[PDB]
């Protein structure tokens, strides 16, 4: 429509809109950003290098007083879609990422209300480093966190706020290997810094053990059960050495395979 393109031109006019300046009025007031993580799939947990992969929708909401208009003057339009690459954005990133991919994947449009409210919901494939606890494998429960921070503006310029106390599962696809237990979010400050603020989500996940039970534990027990037979084997049959050496071989192989799967680090060794 002619009115819509007139409004889009007027709002983004680079003469009167600089996308590199924070939308703070009254001098040194802060811009409040609401944050909310929605989980779509838990793509994979790779225990070997300690990385969790997720498909999440990162909802961000803030106010930009420079993107206001009067609906009566623009055919009574209440909101418009602006490209998020040409407006000011809070540089909210996954701070504890692995492989160095801080940002979101797509950079969708932003929905702008006439009162200045910005709504942004870009999808992202994230890789986050989380410590793996191997002690109780394959009945282990992991606690992998996602930490979100503005790497440009400190706590004095933008304050992060949680839209909800938990991450959403409204559009989740169940994993099939990992069970979701809890996804609580928390807002953290440093009492000795005063410029630090972040929002962190804990993903408590529980492994479904049937696969590794069937494929690792039962064979291990079967091989271990043969460790004793050598002493009931008569010395005349001439097969004691074959039995005991074969058992030792199988045990060494299973140890090496399990170590490839779930590495024993210093803090804990798998039972």
């Amino acid at each position, epitope marked *: 429509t002619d009115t819509e393109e007139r409004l889009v031109e007027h709002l983004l006019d680079p003469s009167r809109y600089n996308k590199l300046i924070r939308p703070a009025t009254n001098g040194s007031e802060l811009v409040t950003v609401q944050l909310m993580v929605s989980l779509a799939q838990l793509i994979s947990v790779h225990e070997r290098e300690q990385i969790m992969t997720t498909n999440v929708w990162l909802t961000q909401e803030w106010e930009d007083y420079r993107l206001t208009w009067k609906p009566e003057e623009f055919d009574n339009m209440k909101k418009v879609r602006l490209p998020s690459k040409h407006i000011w954005l809070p540089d909210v990133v996954l701070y504890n990422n692995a492989d160095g991919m801080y940002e979101v994947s797509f950079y969708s449009n932003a929905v702008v209300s006439y009162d200045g409210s910005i709504f942004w919901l870009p999808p992202a494939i994230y890789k986050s480093a989380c410590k793996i606890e191997v002690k109780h494998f394959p009945f282990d429960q992991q606690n992998c966190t996602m930490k979100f921070r503005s790497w440009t503006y400190d706590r004095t310029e933008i304050d992060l706020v949680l839209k*909800s106390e938990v991450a*959403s*599962l409204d559009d*989740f696809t*169940p994993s099939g290997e990992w069970d979701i237990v809890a996804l609580p979010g928390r807002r953290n400050e440093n009492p000795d810094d005063s410029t630090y603020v972040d929002i962190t989500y804990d993903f408590i996940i529980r492994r479904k053990p049937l696969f590794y039970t069937i494929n690792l534990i039962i064979p291990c027990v079967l091989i271990t059960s043969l460790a004793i037979l050598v002493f009931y084997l008569p010395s005349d049959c001439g097969e004691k050495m074959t039995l005991c050496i074969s058992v030792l071989l199988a045990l060494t192989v299973f140890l090496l395979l399990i170590s490839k799967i779930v590495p024993p680090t210093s803090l804990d060794v798998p039972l």
Partner: antibody, heavy 118, light 113 residues
């Protein structure tokens, strides 16, 4: 927040009853729903739990196979279907919120009394 | 299922008296993170239960300070400093550490006279 349960029921022995717990004012899919049975005599028994977000469900040994949990995401409602009923099933059933290892079960349903008799 | 036993089955105590309820577990219910997930719920007659204490060292919001808790891996107890009329009811101990989670036996509270 608020958890709303269905009304009282009266079913003949051998039938099956489905009672619903509906929650509002919070992210329904991200909280486990705990089902608790209170026989009129005494005691609180946990039937099991369901996470509406996924399909994950848990049951207590005493109730495995006796009850089945299902959840609807479009409408913030969770259902429990009780199998073949007996006179021993007459009790009051509660639904409650829960997030394991964090803030725990601070909101409960009103209660849904169930009566089994011919 | 971890079994939780409460003693005494009843605890008559007049107003202003010290009340002690003990809940014991068939197994250890300590968790790796450092917290132990034990909770105490009060259900007055004709009402749904209420949360009083979670993570015993802690306490819920909106409850009188008189309530308190303590215990170790397998033994836990709840203490009420000053008893009042509104405090009458039944108390249950709930463990949130080992799946499935189970309630306590229930310890009814009376006021003696």
């Amino acid at each position: 927040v608020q958890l709303q349960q269905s009304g009282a029921e009266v079913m003949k022995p051998g039938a099956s009853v489905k009672i619903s717990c509906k929650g509002t004012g919070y992210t329904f899919s991200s909280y486990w729903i705990e089902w608790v049975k209170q026989r009129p005599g005494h005691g609180l028994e946990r039937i099991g739990e369901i996470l509406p977000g996924s399909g994950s469900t848990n049951y207590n040994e005493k109730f495995r196979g006796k009850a089945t949990f299902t959840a609807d995401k479009s409408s913030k409602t969770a259902y429990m279907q009780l199998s073949s009923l007996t006179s021993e099933d007459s009790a009051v059933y509660y639904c409650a919120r829960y997030l394991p290892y964090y803030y725990a079960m601070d909101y409960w349903g009103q209660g849904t009394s169930v009566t089994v008799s011919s | 299922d971890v079994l939780m036993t409460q003693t005494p089955l009843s605890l008559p105590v007049s107003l202003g008296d010290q009340a002690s309820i003990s809940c014991r577990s068939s197994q250890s219910i300590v968790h790796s993170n450092g917290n132990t997930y034990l909770e105490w719920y009060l259900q007055k007659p004709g009402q749904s239960p209420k949360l009083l204490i979670y993570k015993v060292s802690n306490r819920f919001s909106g409850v009188p300070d008189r309530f308190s808790g303590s215990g170790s891996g397998t033994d836990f107890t709840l203490k009420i400093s000053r008893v009042e009329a509104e405090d009458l009811g039944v108390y249950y101990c709930f463990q949130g550490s080992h799946v499935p989670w189970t309630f306590g036996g229930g310890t009814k509270l009376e006021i003696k006279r």
